[PDB]
Amino acid sequence: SNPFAYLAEPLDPAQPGKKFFNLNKLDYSRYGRLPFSIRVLLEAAVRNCDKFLVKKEDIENILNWNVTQHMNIEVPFKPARVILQDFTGVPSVVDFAAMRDAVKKLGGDPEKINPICPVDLVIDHSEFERNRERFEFLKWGSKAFRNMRIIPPGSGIIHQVNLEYLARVVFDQDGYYYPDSLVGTDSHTTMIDGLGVLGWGVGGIEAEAVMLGQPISMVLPQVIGYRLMGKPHPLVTSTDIVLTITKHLRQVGVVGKFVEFFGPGVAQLSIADRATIANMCPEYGATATFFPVDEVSIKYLVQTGRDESKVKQIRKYLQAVGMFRDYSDPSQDPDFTQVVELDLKTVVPCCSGPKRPQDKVAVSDMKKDFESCLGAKQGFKGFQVAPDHHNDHKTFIYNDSEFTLSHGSVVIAAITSSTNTSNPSVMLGAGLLAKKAVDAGLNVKPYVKTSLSPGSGVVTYYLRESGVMPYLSQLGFDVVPLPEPVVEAITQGDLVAVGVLSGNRNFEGRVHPNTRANYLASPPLVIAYAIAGTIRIDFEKEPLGTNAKGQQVFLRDIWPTREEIQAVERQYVIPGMFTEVYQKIETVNASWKLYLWNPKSTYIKSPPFFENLTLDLQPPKSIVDAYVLLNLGDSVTTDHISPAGNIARNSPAARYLTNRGLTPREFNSYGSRRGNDAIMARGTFANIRLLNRFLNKQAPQTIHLPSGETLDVFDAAERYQQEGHPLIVLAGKEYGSGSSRDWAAKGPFLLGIKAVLAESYERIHRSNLVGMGVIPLEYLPGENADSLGLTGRERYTIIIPENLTPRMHVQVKLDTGKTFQAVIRFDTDVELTYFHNGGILNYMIRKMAK
RNA sequence: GUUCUGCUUCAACAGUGUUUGAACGGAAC
Numbered sequence: 001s002n003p004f005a006y007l008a009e010p011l012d013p014a015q016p017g018k019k020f021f022n023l024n025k026l027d028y029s030r031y032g033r034l035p036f037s038i039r040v041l042l043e044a045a046v047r048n049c050d051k052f053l054v055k056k057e058d059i060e061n062i063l064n065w066n067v068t069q070h071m072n073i074e075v076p077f078k079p080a081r082v083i084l085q086d087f088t089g090v091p092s093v094v095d096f097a098a099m100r101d102a103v104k105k106l107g108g109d110p111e112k113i114n115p116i117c118p119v120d121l122v123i124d125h126s127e128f129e130r131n132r133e134r135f136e137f138l139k140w141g142s143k144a145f146r147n148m149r150i151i152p153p154g155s156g157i158i159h160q161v162n163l164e165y166l167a168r169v170v171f172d173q174d175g176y177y178y179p180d181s182l183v184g185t186d187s188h189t190t191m192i193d194g195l196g197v198l199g200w201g202v203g204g205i206e207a208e209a210v211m212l213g214q215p216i217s218m219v220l221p222q223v224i225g226y227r228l229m230g231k232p233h234p235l236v237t238s239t240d241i242v243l244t245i246t247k248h249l250r251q252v253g254v255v256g257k258f259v260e261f262f263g264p265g266v267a268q269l270s271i272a273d274r275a276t277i278a279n280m281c282p283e284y285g286a287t288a289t290f291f292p293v294d295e296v297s298i299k300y301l302v303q304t305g306r307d308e309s310k311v312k313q314i315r316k317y318l319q320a321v322g323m324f325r326d327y328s329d330p331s332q333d334p335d336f337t338q339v340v341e342l343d344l345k346t347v348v349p350c351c352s353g354p355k356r357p358q359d360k361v362a363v364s365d366m367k368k369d370f371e372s373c374l375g376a377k378q379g380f381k382g383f384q385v386a387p388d389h390h391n392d393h394k395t396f397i398y399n400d401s402e403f404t405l406s407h408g409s410v411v412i413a414a415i416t417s418s419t420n421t422s423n424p425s426v427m428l429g430a431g432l433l434a435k436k437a438v439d440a441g442l443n444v445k446p447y448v449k450t451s452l453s454p455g456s457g458v459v460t461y462y463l464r465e466s467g468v469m470p471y472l473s474q475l476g477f478d479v480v481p482l483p484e485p486v487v488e489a490i491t492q493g494d495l496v497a498v499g500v501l502s503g504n505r506n507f508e509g510r511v512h513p514n515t516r517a518n519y520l521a522s523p524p525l526v527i528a529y530a531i532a533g534t535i536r537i538d539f540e541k542e543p544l545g546t547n548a549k550g551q552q553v554f555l556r557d558i559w560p561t562r563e564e565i566q567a568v569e570r571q572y573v574i575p576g577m578f579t580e581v582y583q584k585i586e587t588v589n590a591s592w593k594l595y596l597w598n599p600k601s602t603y604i605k606s607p608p609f610f611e612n613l614t615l616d617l618q619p620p621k622s623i624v625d626a627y628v629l630l631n632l633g634d635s636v637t638t639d640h641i642s643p644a645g646n647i648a649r650n651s652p653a654a655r656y657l658t659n660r661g662l663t664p665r666e667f668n669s670y671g672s673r674r675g676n677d678a679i680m681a682r683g684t685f686a687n688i689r690l691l692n693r694f695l696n697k698q699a700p701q702t703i704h705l706p707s708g709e710t711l712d713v714f715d716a717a718e719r720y721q722q723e724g725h726p727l728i729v730l731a732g733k734e735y736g737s738g739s740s741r742d743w744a745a746k747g748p749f750l751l752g753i754k755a756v757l758a759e760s761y762e763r764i765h766r767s768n769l770v771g772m773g774v775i776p777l778e779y780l781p782g783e784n785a786d787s788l789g790l791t792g793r794e795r796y797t798i799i800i801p802e803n804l805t806p807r808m809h810v811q812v813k814l815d816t817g818k819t820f821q822a823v824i825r826f827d828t829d830v831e832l833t834y835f836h837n838g839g840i841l842n843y844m845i846r847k848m849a850k
Numbered sequence: 851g852u853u854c855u856g857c858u859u860c861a862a863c864a865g866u867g868u869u870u871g872a873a874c875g876g877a878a879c
Contacts, residue, residue, distance in 0.1 A: 357864045419867040504864040645856040646876040671857040
């Protein structure tokens with residue numbers, strides 16, 4: 001029973017069936033001071049309290065965040081949903097399919113087996129035949145399981161849009177309202193925190209654990225509050241703001257922490273801006289950068305097609321539980337761990353040049369700075385030209401017209417794509433500037449080499465939907481060697497001509513031999529300098545050009561404010577962008593409960609995990625006279641345990657593949673074979689860099705002690721299982737460190753390994769092993785292989801008691817009479833339960849077949 | 851000797867990207 005059910009009440013009395021956990025009633029004093037990001041964790045634990053996977057001390061720990069943040073305590077995080085990128089969800093769907101077969105064979109309803117939460121299979125990357133089977137398998141899954149949706153290949157290939165498309169922000173499901181939140185096997189997951197949705201990327205195994213009902217374990221984080229106030233000056237672009245906030249966070253030191261935004265300034269950042277910041281958190285090391293749901297967010301939901309009524313209810317919910325943000329109201333502000341601040345008036349627009357991308361010069365100083373460079377002695381910021389020559393200039397004819405070319409004249413104005421994701425808005429800004437310039441009679445001298453290659457992507461929507469290309473075209477910028485006259489005037493006058501470039505994508509690549517000076521600036525600034533034809537200008541007190549009719553026009557007259565840009569964005573660009581997606585998804589899923597495993601397949605196979613699984617729990621079996629399969633040292637990485645990349649031709653995996661009619665050229669990678677336990681098991685400990693102490697040298701092998709033969713690890717393990725010998729692995733410190741490897745636990749399980757004895761375990765991996773039924777043993781403080789004399793050739797016996805207690809001590813008796821203690825590393829009752837059930841998957845099977 | 855090319859590794863930052871570079875792995879002759 002949920003001890004906090006008394007908090008559940010109807011959001012709207014006219015709808016008794018739709019409830020929400022009123023966190024306000026839990027403890028208003030501490031709740032109202034909590035960072036909004038932490039509130040999402042809180043609500044999640046509270047609604048899922050089950051006195052087991054999520055205990056009430058857990059809810060207490062989160063609620064007491066202000067204090068606990070400093071005691072490094074583990075709390076559970078139960079996401080509202082999961083995202084499985086590309087084909088990373090194959091092993092997971094295979095487990096669930098195999099789990100259904102398992103429940104069938106026990107006389108139960110297979111359909112009782114299903115992912116606890118919604119899962120979105122996002123296969124949006126852009127050999128198609130190489131993935132056909134795996135694609136097919138996941139498609140079957142989307143139909144066989146509930147709440148399992150799929151974004152197929154050949155539809156939305158603009159990731160960002162797909163993620164926001166899948167963002168609920170607030171769930172209205174099974175009679176409850178709760179905040180949207182997730183974890184995905186997609187590194188870009190953190191991007192969605194810009195829209196108020198808490199979440200980040202995790203390992204494949206952790207994602208599956210979520211699908212199995214297991215919370216992500218995590219240290220209650222500190223929360224750096226980043227405040228935004230003031231207004232930015234006129235020429236300041238989104239990228240300027242983003243890079244400032246981004247670069248700052250890096251220095252502040254937020255690695256391992258949460259970053260939550262606030263201050264009246266947040267109201268000035270569009271969802272696109274927020275998403276860009278959140279998405280770059282890997283760069284500054286934060287776990288997540290959260291932007292509470294405010295009116296901007298809500299309005300964004302409408303812009304994407306969600307309907308008014310639903311959205312209105314979402315806001316009502318957020319206001320009721322106290323998770324709706326009003327950045328203008330300081331009284332609402334949380335009690336952050338630390339506060340960093342940024343006055344937008346502080347950001348200063350700049351250009352880089354005239355020779356190095358590192359040499360920054362404020363836009364308002366371009367004139368002075370350039371004129372100083374003319375004098376200065378030939379340096380990175382000097383061309384040295386006889387003081388009299390400064391005001392030089394020659395003339396020339398171009399297309400039956402005359403033009404003068406003074407020093408600092410602009411001959412090239414090229415706009416290219418930026419890698420930074422806030423570029424789209426900035427490009428739109430460049431366009432809106434064009435429109436206003438054209439409307440004001442301005443133009444760009446014909447001889448100026450002007451180009452525009454925005455690249456592909458989201459920017460396309462921003463240009464097209466805003467109907468700005470016509471104007472950009474009129475000024476010489478159309479979607480994609482200077483005139484002979486110009487090159488002559490430059491050289492004949494021995495002039496320092498200028499090139500203006502937007503986009504960081506390669507600098508020295510287009511530095512014309514004729515452009516002695518070159519600057520990097522924002523897209524709109526490029527166009528501007530092209531209208532002005534020179535950088536020796538002071539935009540504050542100098543016309544961009546005299547109206548083809550009467551008066552003069554100033555830069556300030558045609559430069560779009562961030563608000564104007566955001567207005568065009570929200571009423572034309574975003575709506576269009578998402579309409580196209582609902583469609584590309586709808587019409588593509590149209591061309592279409594137990595899995596019919598194909599024996600001829602080499603990509604999908606039913607795992608052995610549940611052979612002879614009995615509905616009743618049998619008492620734990622001791623490990624008797626086991627043999628050590630591998631005697632390892634320190635820092636054995638997950639990639640050593642389960643390698644990534646291609647398959648060696650001299651491997652158990654290769655032989656297996658050969659024996660089935662496959663040639664080397666068609667083996668593919670271990671990664672691609674994750675849905676076939678046969679190949680993955682054969683790849684366990686197949687890393688050529690493996691350093692087995694039994695051999696004192698890098699080799700994917702071990703000694704089959706009975707024979708003394710040295711075979712590839714899998715092979716030795718096979719033999720051992722045939723002979724009926726239990727197996728265990730010895731290891732040094734930090735066992736299982738390294739990046740996520742889907743089979744780092746399952747592989748060892750299929751090699752017959754019943755236990756591991758290490759000096760130290762990397763947190764996650766230890767958990768992964770428990771999950772698969774494997775026993776993690778740890779030497780007592782101070783002891784290890786050498787201390788104890790262990791050679792790895794003795795036969796090990798470990799007698800497990802039926803009354804196991806967390807971190808209990810057990811004896812290990814060798815067949816040489818020797819004896820010693822070790823810690824059986826099951827850290828919690830949940831973990832003990834998985835052990836008794838033989839693993840988390842097995843536990844799930846029993847809980848369902850009733 | 852030539853050519854083609856990952857649940858990889860490492861590095862860089864006009865600036866974090868379906869980025870750039872390098873390494874290793876893999877395939878073919």
